[PDB]
Swiss-Prot record, chains A, B, C, D:
Gene Ontology BP terms: intracellular iron ion homeostasis; iron ion transport
Similarity remark: Belongs to the ferritin family.
Subunit structure: Oligomer of 24 subunits. The functional molecule is roughly spherical and contains a central cavity into which the polymeric mineral iron core is deposited.
Cellular component per GO, a single term: cytoplasm
The organism of origin for this protein: Aquarana catesbeiana (American bullfrog)
Protein name per its UniProtKB record: Ferritin, middle subunit
Top-rank lineage group of the source organism: Eukaryota
Sequence ranges assigned to domain Ferritin-like diiron in this UniProt record: 6-155
Anything else known: There are three types of ferritin subunits in amphibia: L, M and H chains. M and H chains are fast mineralizing; the L chain is very slow mineralizing.
GO MF, one annotated term: ferric iron binding
PANTHER family, per the entry: FERRITIN (PTHR11431:SF54)
Length: 171, 171, 171, 171
């Protein structure tokens, strides 16, 4: 047992490792979206940079879980980072839709981890999730939903002018 | 009943008073460690100052509980501050080991208070503990554990050169 | 065919994708080393931060290949990022030895890519590798070799005092 | 023989003169595009200025070859600068398409010169091309391709509103 370990359940330690992997997976998906929008035959650079920024954000989320694991006396265990679901992302609307679903998947995993922490009576882990993850997640989901509403308003996927306008005025 | 009192259980009020006393006890133990490392036949001044700083931190923790008690309409009840367990602390490793155990004792009391607050459905007290105590406690425990690992690496208790090096490069 | 594509062989495009994956793999290995040295029972924070910085450097190398691929009209194709070879890294010497071998593996892949680019008469790709990768790689290999020499001098793996001194004066 | 001349093949000297002429030709084509978009019945001033800037860039490329020729002890030999292929450029999409093809023509000539320099074992000329020409060429081709993708997205040539929007938000 680690000398620092106190009130930290094995199940929570394992779930933190799985959560870490999911954050890395989300980062990698966003990296893929960046590369797609940077293609010469897609060429929506502000959209590309939005996804690149999100990729970095998700990596930071993962690193914060590594730090957390060690602070509690748990042990970081890494697994493969699976490649993203798609190799190409269609257009701004399809990508934003995929991002919304990804964000909700990550959110569900965070909420499940919070429930586990609650069941194991771990208020430190609860606080960590509430203070560092859950609100940023709600904010991100709201921003992406707002974007989707606007992309539909702008006539996506068919309206190329609408897609151009979004890239130039929303991101 | 205090005019401000709302959703504050008698059991929680009493437990806050006991927690206050424990913080003062921890402060006093750290004061003792400061005085020991300041001895001419011990003479590890950076180590002494580390413990002096922790003594002040613990006193601040106690004062914050006094303020909390009054904010909720509870009444501060003081008891004797018991003298520390030891009069002399051996060396840097023994002292850090004692500090780790003290920090875990304080942490357990905070977690027990959080459980009581949860049982009495007191979210304000839960928030207070999570926002002002529980994370600082985890951070402090991690720092002391890290120190112990390094002190063992440096050959404590036997290696006096190792002890000197720690005082000059870690604190 | 991409409208921008000129003098860019399919073999080079594929090799750039494989190189990208290797950079990500190297990043992930360094992330693992960071987490290990951040453990409470390892606790060499300057060493941890060295590896964390290298993890970020390798990610930047990967992103630069993504940008390169698109600039030439190639298409980014991502694969799984394999987890690192080890879950724990022994000590500073073992980790630095693993880092040296990793850096040489990455260097060999860069040199192989340069040879392919030479065979396909692609001076732009040659220039990119020479200007952005090959010298940084030689510099990094030299720095790590220098560290290993010093760690051996300091009596690693047995000499814990030597390991402490390295963390406090070399990184 | 020039007193400075060393490892400079007659074939490379002649090819540098031809390359110089091509840069001047490219400059002149861009000047024509500037004048077209400045017409009162075309009136896309940001597009005009983009081409004017490129005209100046190409002239600078030519001047750098003159300087290069003298540095190696070769002799600058000038030929007529042929007028551009067209007197009018249709619209933003047609012009960008012509610019892409022009840039690829210039790029091919640079790559051919690099191959000649390689065959004649002239690393100074290789370095000059790689360091001063080849990457700027790839960057320019990528930018123009990105523009074409966006112009098509915006409904060019038919969509006049799309053309206006491009002029006001992309250049
Ligand atoms: Cl535990
Ligand atoms: Cl507990
Ligand atoms: Cl457990
Ligand atoms: Cl696990
Ligand atoms: Cl009450
Ligand atoms: Cl209530
Ligand atoms: Cl009560
Ligand atoms: Cl009481
Ligand atoms: Cl090609
Ligand atoms: Cl070619
Ligand atoms: Cl090919
Ligand atoms: Cl591939
Ligand atoms: Cl010569
Ligand atoms: Cl020679
Ligand atoms: Cl000759
Ligand atoms: Cl000539
Ligand atoms: Fe995340
Ligand atoms: Fe996210
Ligand atoms: Fe305290
Ligand atoms: Fe404390
Ligand atoms: Fe790298
Ligand atoms: Fe590297
Ligand atoms: Fe040029
Ligand atoms: Fe050009
Ligand atoms: Mg376990
Ligand atoms: Mg998973
Ligand atoms: Mg798979
Ligand atoms: Mg918050
Ligand atoms: Mg009472
Ligand atoms: Mg007590
Ligand atoms: Mg007594
Ligand atoms: Mg709560
Ligand atoms: Mg907090
Ligand atoms: Mg291919
Ligand atoms: Mg590979
Ligand atoms: Mg495997
Ligand atoms: Mg070069
Ligand atoms: Mg260089
Ligand atoms: Mg001649
Ligand atoms: Mg010509
Ligand atoms: Mg003619
Ligand atoms: Mg360059």
């Amino acid at each position: 047992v680690s000398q620092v370990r106190q009130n930290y359940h094995s199940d929570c330690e394992a779930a933190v490792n799985r959560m870490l992997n999911l954050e890395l997976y989300a980062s990698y998906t966003y990296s893929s979206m960046y590369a797609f929008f940077d293609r010469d035959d897609v060429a929506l650079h502000n959209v590309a940079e939005f996804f690149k920024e999100h990729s970095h954000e998700e990596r930071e989320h993962a690193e914060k879980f590594m730090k957390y694991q060690n602070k509690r006396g748990g042990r970081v265990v890494l697994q493969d980072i699976k490649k993203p679901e798609r190799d190409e992302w269609g257009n701004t609307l399809e990508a934003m839709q995929a991002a919304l679903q990804l964000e909700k998947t990550v959110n569900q995993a965070l909420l499940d981890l919070h429930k586990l922490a609650t069941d194991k009576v771990d208020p430190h882990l609860c606080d960590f999730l509430e203070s560092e993850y859950l609100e940023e997640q709600v904010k991100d989901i709201k921003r992406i939903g707002d974007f989707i509403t606007n992309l539909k308003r702008l006539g996506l996927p068919e309206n190329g002018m609408g897609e151009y306008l979004f890239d130039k005025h929303s991101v």
